[PDB]
């Protein structure tokens, strides 16, 4: 039904791939019966330009005041020189912690017409359908101390600090995910060495009894890296800590070699989320309409599914996104079968075609 | 020349594979004629049994009086039920630190006759030949504090700590190792976040001065990871901290499907080192004489190169190992050509053969 949306196109191709999103986003809404009022805001370099800050003060309002945020991308050679404090990326990492988003979902499903783009043989990547769930707030990244001690500073340390609550929420969000997917979860840690992974494994084990129909399995971080390349089709949902995830995600993001196609979601406790494609802002290409709207489109379908429980539509989008690709219609970047390269806009249209008849 | 080698076969297919190696050596050291005195030593299950600990004090002595260590594997059903402090595996990590080995090398070279094994496409896995250098004394693995604390003990912590030296030495090695290969050295870290990686990115930059013939690059750990899969054919030598090196190594162990034939070498300061096959002890097939001995034999060739400088005695073996797979011979796990499957020993005979 009625929903409110915060649109932050951003830099580079951001605005192009976001238009595709918005148009197709409406095509299915008023087609199913639901309503929705958008409302833009500046983020990244563009905000730096008309507000002096990549994360403008009023943008946060537009966000807090809305249900979900649809993000494009930030970046560009221009501000590539500004002093850290004031740069595109700072602005993005900012609203991320401002919204308190602690879990990042990475859905990696294979497509029949793109497999030839994968580095893996057809039999290992074909029919892959998983989601990497990475922890975002704790870990070795935020843990203090992180200093050089000396004498002479001939010593240094970094810290991996976690709390029962941070571990228990990312892991729980994980079970709920698998719960509604193929109910198969696999907790990834390094429990045979780190005390942090032992607590994690102890926790994931406790939470296990609060979801009886979900098959929990443990796995060491090093072995999961091999299985992701050897037999990734075995996975459903994977939940791991901050660092291990900032890797499993990436790795998992190439075994299909269908990027600029991958969707990304950042959630938290309730249903508020920020969806954005994986690919960057690709500055040296904006204006040309070469932008692949698909990674941002699929991104939108996710918002519908996780943020508003509107599965039909959610799958409608990705189902459409599948047909269009079969016909041979794509925007150059993808290496579709026979092929039939169109434009960002021409493709957005074909998507609205399937979505209507 | 002369060399004393301690032989620690272990349990399982270990003694079987260690024997292939011995023979090959005893054949090769009679390439340019060198005296090799072998001395066996118990380790793991073998030791538990007739000693009482997976690392007899007598075994350590033998290593100490040795110029190198040849090792099979430990691990056995029969000993996987007793206490973690008296299990086969504890003996290894101990022999590990006890010898002060701080650098782990694990070279991966694709075989034109084993490509069907790889989960990768020819175009990507072929032409692969590289080495991962994993630091072994720092990282979260060995960093204090590391325990649960706080109210209700609901907080945990692990410490990633390193000394200026630990980082310096593991980088010298990788630099000299790169020195004698394609002269390339990719240094992997997390400089954009960890303080440790920053000091590392520096320690490395300085040592770069000392070796201007090498071309030193830098890659964040998470990028190296997808590259090892999207384009691993670009790497020669890569060095990285203890934790990143653990994940990255096993990541390079799958891109070829040659598990049964990956060698390894735990090095340190001088030329003393411990060598072994990357694979485990496969107790399941011990005795059936079907174990693949190549992994352990490449390790022996490795010992020759790094521990004595017989850059050719070693190479002879490597080329030998490559010829026999070229004629279609293999032990079973190998997915060769129309290939002729033969026993652990037969295959061994084929190498001794090629070796002249």
mmCIF file of C-alpha atoms in Angstrom, chain A residues 104-296:
data_model
loop_
_atom_site.group_PDB
_atom_site.id
_atom_site.type_symbol
_atom_site.label_atom_id
_atom_site.label_comp_id
_atom_site.label_asym_id
_atom_site.label_seq_id
_atom_site.Cartn_x
_atom_site.Cartn_y
_atom_site.Cartn_z
ATOM 1 C CA UNK A 104 24.792 -5.913 5.321
ATOM 2 C CA UNK A 105 23.115 -8.506 3.126
ATOM 3 C CA UNK A 106 24.807 -9.650 -0.060
ATOM 4 C CA UNK A 107 22.533 -11.692 -2.302
ATOM 5 C CA UNK A 108 24.502 -13.673 -4.888
ATOM 6 C CA UNK A 109 22.311 -15.627 -7.302
ATOM 7 C CA UNK A 110 23.449 -16.877 -10.704
ATOM 8 C CA UNK A 111 21.835 -16.053 -14.072
ATOM 9 C CA UNK A 112 21.717 -18.475 -17.021
ATOM 10 C CA UNK A 113 22.657 -15.876 -19.653
ATOM 11 C CA UNK A 114 25.699 -14.600 -17.732
ATOM 12 C CA UNK A 115 27.580 -17.712 -16.582
ATOM 13 C CA UNK A 116 30.075 -17.348 -19.448
ATOM 14 C CA UNK A 117 31.091 -14.222 -17.611
ATOM 15 C CA UNK A 118 32.022 -16.288 -14.543
ATOM 16 C CA UNK A 119 35.631 -17.391 -13.882
ATOM 17 C CA UNK A 120 34.266 -20.724 -12.665
ATOM 18 C CA UNK A 121 33.248 -23.688 -14.786
ATOM 19 C CA UNK A 122 29.533 -23.845 -15.601
ATOM 20 C CA UNK A 123 28.969 -26.766 -13.175
ATOM 21 C CA UNK A 124 30.229 -24.969 -10.055
ATOM 22 C CA UNK A 125 28.605 -21.522 -10.402
ATOM 23 C CA UNK A 126 25.417 -22.543 -12.217
ATOM 24 C CA UNK A 127 22.354 -22.538 -9.974
ATOM 25 C CA UNK A 128 23.987 -20.674 -7.048
ATOM 26 C CA UNK A 129 21.604 -18.775 -4.764
ATOM 27 C CA UNK A 130 23.052 -17.378 -1.550
ATOM 28 C CA UNK A 131 23.267 -14.362 0.740
ATOM 29 C CA UNK A 132 26.387 -13.323 2.676
ATOM 30 C CA UNK A 133 25.388 -11.599 5.933
ATOM 31 C CA UNK A 134 28.210 -9.434 7.305
ATOM 32 C CA UNK A 135 28.406 -7.787 10.726
ATOM 33 C CA UNK A 136 29.042 -4.011 10.447
ATOM 34 C CA UNK A 137 29.397 -2.487 13.914
ATOM 35 C CA UNK A 138 31.897 -4.605 15.831
ATOM 36 C CA UNK A 139 35.139 -6.306 14.961
ATOM 37 C CA UNK A 140 38.770 -5.498 14.411
ATOM 38 C CA UNK A 141 37.872 -2.297 12.618
ATOM 39 C CA UNK A 142 36.302 -0.366 15.502
ATOM 40 C CA UNK A 143 38.018 -2.077 18.425
ATOM 41 C CA UNK A 144 40.387 0.085 20.476
ATOM 42 C CA UNK A 145 43.346 0.258 21.178
ATOM 43 C CA UNK A 146 44.802 0.613 17.682
ATOM 44 C CA UNK A 147 48.173 2.308 18.293
ATOM 45 C CA UNK A 148 51.955 1.968 17.961
ATOM 46 C CA UNK A 149 53.435 1.652 21.466
ATOM 47 C CA UNK A 150 57.230 1.720 21.353
ATOM 48 C CA UNK A 151 59.936 2.367 22.763
ATOM 49 C CA UNK A 152 60.732 3.767 19.331
ATOM 50 C CA UNK A 153 57.301 2.465 18.325
ATOM 51 C CA UNK A 154 58.652 -1.026 17.626
ATOM 52 C CA UNK A 155 55.259 -2.427 18.500
ATOM 53 C CA UNK A 156 51.643 -2.092 17.351
ATOM 54 C CA UNK A 157 48.220 -3.569 18.097
ATOM 55 C CA UNK A 158 44.726 -3.718 16.666
ATOM 56 C CA UNK A 159 41.772 -5.070 18.628
ATOM 57 C CA UNK A 160 38.865 -7.357 17.795
ATOM 58 C CA UNK A 161 36.219 -6.440 20.373
ATOM 59 C CA UNK A 162 32.614 -7.690 20.464
ATOM 60 C CA UNK A 163 29.686 -7.787 22.920
ATOM 61 C CA UNK A 164 26.978 -10.378 23.493
ATOM 62 C CA UNK A 165 24.413 -7.971 22.055
ATOM 63 C CA UNK A 166 26.192 -7.145 18.781
ATOM 64 C CA UNK A 167 26.804 -10.854 18.181
ATOM 65 C CA UNK A 168 23.242 -11.827 19.150
ATOM 66 C CA UNK A 169 21.478 -9.369 16.825
ATOM 67 C CA UNK A 170 23.433 -9.933 13.610
ATOM 68 C CA UNK A 171 23.131 -13.685 14.155
ATOM 69 C CA UNK A 172 19.429 -13.458 14.917
ATOM 70 C CA UNK A 173 18.713 -11.330 11.868
ATOM 71 C CA UNK A 174 20.514 -14.119 10.056
ATOM 72 C CA UNK A 175 18.222 -16.912 11.262
ATOM 73 C CA UNK A 176 15.139 -14.894 10.373
ATOM 74 C CA UNK A 177 16.613 -14.527 6.870
ATOM 75 C CA UNK A 178 17.264 -18.222 6.285
ATOM 76 C CA UNK A 179 13.933 -18.831 7.986
ATOM 77 C CA UNK A 180 12.139 -17.297 5.028
ATOM 78 C CA UNK A 181 14.555 -18.595 2.399
ATOM 79 C CA UNK A 182 15.686 -22.214 2.206
ATOM 80 C CA UNK A 183 15.850 -22.386 6.025
ATOM 81 C CA UNK A 184 19.510 -23.454 5.980
ATOM 82 C CA UNK A 185 22.033 -21.340 7.918
ATOM 83 C CA UNK A 186 25.804 -21.641 8.208
ATOM 84 C CA UNK A 187 27.660 -19.647 10.898
ATOM 85 C CA UNK A 188 31.215 -18.738 9.942
ATOM 86 C CA UNK A 189 33.927 -18.049 12.521
ATOM 87 C CA UNK A 190 37.481 -19.007 13.543
ATOM 88 C CA UNK A 191 36.515 -20.641 16.842
ATOM 89 C CA UNK A 192 39.522 -22.924 17.137
ATOM 90 C CA UNK A 193 41.800 -19.930 17.807
ATOM 91 C CA UNK A 194 39.946 -16.713 18.696
ATOM 92 C CA UNK A 195 37.975 -16.352 21.944
ATOM 93 C CA UNK A 196 35.654 -14.020 20.055
ATOM 94 C CA UNK A 197 34.669 -16.782 17.608
ATOM 95 C CA UNK A 198 34.076 -19.143 20.520
ATOM 96 C CA UNK A 199 31.590 -16.738 22.027
ATOM 97 C CA UNK A 200 30.073 -16.333 18.574
ATOM 98 C CA UNK A 201 29.725 -20.069 18.104
ATOM 99 C CA UNK A 202 28.268 -20.353 21.630
ATOM 100 C CA UNK A 203 25.757 -17.658 20.812
ATOM 101 C CA UNK A 204 24.746 -18.888 17.334
ATOM 102 C CA UNK A 205 24.260 -22.215 19.050
ATOM 103 C CA UNK A 206 21.908 -20.770 21.679
ATOM 104 C CA UNK A 207 19.841 -18.841 19.120
ATOM 105 C CA UNK A 208 19.594 -22.097 17.164
ATOM 106 C CA UNK A 209 16.969 -23.454 19.528
ATOM 107 C CA UNK A 210 14.715 -20.451 18.812
ATOM 108 C CA UNK A 211 14.320 -21.478 15.166
ATOM 109 C CA UNK A 212 13.823 -25.269 15.198
ATOM 110 C CA UNK A 213 13.184 -25.485 11.431
ATOM 111 C CA UNK A 214 16.559 -23.941 10.476
ATOM 112 C CA UNK A 215 19.545 -26.279 9.982
ATOM 113 C CA UNK A 216 22.516 -24.527 11.619
ATOM 114 C CA UNK A 217 26.005 -25.644 10.549
ATOM 115 C CA UNK A 218 29.339 -24.234 11.665
ATOM 116 C CA UNK A 219 32.360 -23.643 9.410
ATOM 117 C CA UNK A 220 35.815 -22.204 9.791
ATOM 118 C CA UNK A 221 36.525 -18.981 7.892
ATOM 119 C CA UNK A 222 39.325 -20.540 5.849
ATOM 120 C CA UNK A 223 37.274 -23.535 4.705
ATOM 121 C CA UNK A 224 34.329 -21.377 3.711
ATOM 122 C CA UNK A 225 36.664 -19.527 1.366
ATOM 123 C CA UNK A 226 37.433 -22.788 -0.450
ATOM 124 C CA UNK A 227 33.878 -24.049 -0.571
ATOM 125 C CA UNK A 228 32.765 -20.738 -2.043
ATOM 126 C CA UNK A 229 34.954 -21.584 -5.060
ATOM 127 C CA UNK A 230 34.665 -25.389 -4.967
ATOM 128 C CA UNK A 231 30.936 -25.788 -4.335
ATOM 129 C CA UNK A 232 29.136 -22.474 -3.638
ATOM 130 C CA UNK A 233 25.780 -24.001 -4.570
ATOM 131 C CA UNK A 234 25.673 -25.682 -1.151
ATOM 132 C CA UNK A 235 25.029 -22.391 0.630
ATOM 133 C CA UNK A 236 21.817 -20.585 1.495
ATOM 134 C CA UNK A 237 22.477 -17.947 4.174
ATOM 135 C CA UNK A 238 25.931 -17.234 5.606
ATOM 136 C CA UNK A 239 26.417 -15.029 8.645
ATOM 137 C CA UNK A 240 29.888 -13.926 9.702
ATOM 138 C CA UNK A 241 31.719 -11.253 11.690
ATOM 139 C CA UNK A 242 32.869 -7.855 10.420
ATOM 140 C CA UNK A 243 36.273 -8.757 8.999
ATOM 141 C CA UNK A 244 35.473 -12.254 7.716
ATOM 142 C CA UNK A 245 32.462 -10.770 5.961
ATOM 143 C CA UNK A 246 34.344 -7.874 4.368
ATOM 144 C CA UNK A 247 35.990 -10.746 2.521
ATOM 145 C CA UNK A 248 33.481 -13.526 1.971
ATOM 146 C CA UNK A 249 31.322 -10.853 0.408
ATOM 147 C CA UNK A 250 33.978 -9.782 -2.092
ATOM 148 C CA UNK A 251 35.012 -13.324 -2.921
ATOM 149 C CA UNK A 252 31.372 -14.326 -3.326
ATOM 150 C CA UNK A 253 31.000 -11.262 -5.554
ATOM 151 C CA UNK A 254 33.262 -12.605 -8.281
ATOM 152 C CA UNK A 255 32.407 -16.284 -8.495
ATOM 153 C CA UNK A 256 29.508 -15.204 -10.700
ATOM 154 C CA UNK A 257 31.357 -12.414 -12.492
ATOM 155 C CA UNK A 258 28.010 -10.667 -12.880
ATOM 156 C CA UNK A 259 28.682 -7.413 -11.003
ATOM 157 C CA UNK A 260 27.083 -4.123 -11.954
ATOM 158 C CA UNK A 261 24.248 -6.578 -11.482
ATOM 159 C CA UNK A 262 24.598 -7.271 -7.771
ATOM 160 C CA UNK A 263 22.184 -5.678 -5.242
ATOM 161 C CA UNK A 264 23.134 -4.638 -1.708
ATOM 162 C CA UNK A 265 21.085 -4.119 1.467
ATOM 163 C CA UNK A 266 21.946 -2.602 4.878
ATOM 164 C CA UNK A 267 19.482 -3.329 7.667
ATOM 165 C CA UNK A 268 19.066 -3.274 11.412
ATOM 166 C CA UNK A 269 16.596 -4.418 14.063
ATOM 167 C CA UNK A 270 13.284 -3.193 12.606
ATOM 168 C CA UNK A 271 12.332 -2.814 8.909
ATOM 169 C CA UNK A 272 14.181 0.394 7.920
ATOM 170 C CA UNK A 273 16.893 -0.175 5.323
ATOM 171 C CA UNK A 274 19.208 1.455 2.777
ATOM 172 C CA UNK A 275 19.441 -0.308 -0.564
ATOM 173 C CA UNK A 276 22.125 0.337 -3.174
ATOM 174 C CA UNK A 277 23.866 -1.523 -6.031
ATOM 175 C CA UNK A 278 27.303 -2.990 -5.334
ATOM 176 C CA UNK A 279 29.124 -1.323 -8.218
ATOM 177 C CA UNK A 280 30.645 2.121 -7.723
ATOM 178 C CA UNK A 281 29.611 5.525 -9.090
ATOM 179 C CA UNK A 282 31.575 4.890 -12.308
ATOM 180 C CA UNK A 283 32.292 8.591 -12.985
ATOM 181 C CA UNK A 284 34.162 8.317 -16.303
ATOM 182 C CA UNK A 285 31.011 7.070 -18.036
ATOM 183 C CA UNK A 286 28.154 9.108 -16.616
ATOM 184 C CA UNK A 287 25.963 11.000 -19.065
ATOM 185 C CA UNK A 288 26.431 8.313 -21.706
ATOM 186 C CA UNK A 289 23.610 6.143 -20.385
ATOM 187 C CA UNK A 290 25.843 3.090 -20.460
ATOM 188 C CA UNK A 291 24.963 2.589 -16.811
ATOM 189 C CA UNK A 292 23.541 -0.829 -15.950
ATOM 190 C CA UNK A 293 20.305 -0.065 -14.058
ATOM 191 C CA UNK A 294 19.989 -3.711 -13.049
ATOM 192 C CA UNK A 295 22.156 -3.720 -9.914
ATOM 193 C CA UNK A 296 20.143 -0.753 -8.687
#
